[PDB]
Amino acid sequence: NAVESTLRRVAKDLTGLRQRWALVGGFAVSARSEPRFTRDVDIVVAVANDDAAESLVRQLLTQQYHLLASVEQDAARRLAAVRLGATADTAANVVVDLLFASCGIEPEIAEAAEEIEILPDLVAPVATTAHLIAMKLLARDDDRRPQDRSDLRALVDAASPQDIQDARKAIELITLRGFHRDRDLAAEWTRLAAK
Incomplete structure (x- = not known):
């Protein structure tokens, strides 16, 4: 509900920004297999480099999101992901995870x-x-x-x-x-798989 409202919002915001993006996490697993309980939005965003990722994050923090955490690493891509706090809806606050260079195959x-x-x-x-x-x-x-x-x-x-x-x-x-x-x-x- 509030989670669904957040999804619609971040979906329209990333597409309006012409970002190459994809849903992962619970909504995606639910879609591909069996619906299961989902309380946040997890998204892969393919960008060129850290500078592009940071430019996108600054653009979202001008809108209805605030930064909760950054995941940084020693790799060539130093910004792996950010966790944002969404305020699209008012029943509860909802988390949105943006993955840039977390699993390595975001593109x-x-x-x-x-x-x-x-x-x-x-x-x-x-x-x-x-x-x-x-x-x-x-x-x-x-x-x-x-x-x-x-x-x-x-x-x-x-x-x-x-x-x-x-x-x-x-x-x-x-x-x-x-x-x-x-x-x-x-x-x-x-x-x-052997179980």
């Missing part, structure tokens, strides 16, 4: 995303099932994020064989770019 995710009617009269770009599988494998944390393991099950159960292969190729690109850190994500996937 490919925005490019492969597909237009889907998420809400009545809201068509938004949604990450592919394969890209969501890759993202959830990377982000899985059972002490801090137990929804990831369940989301991953739902996504794999909803995927086609080609989706699975696309996910494995998405994992290799993440790894080629160093975003795996020290982890063999494909081997982790195999072991989770």
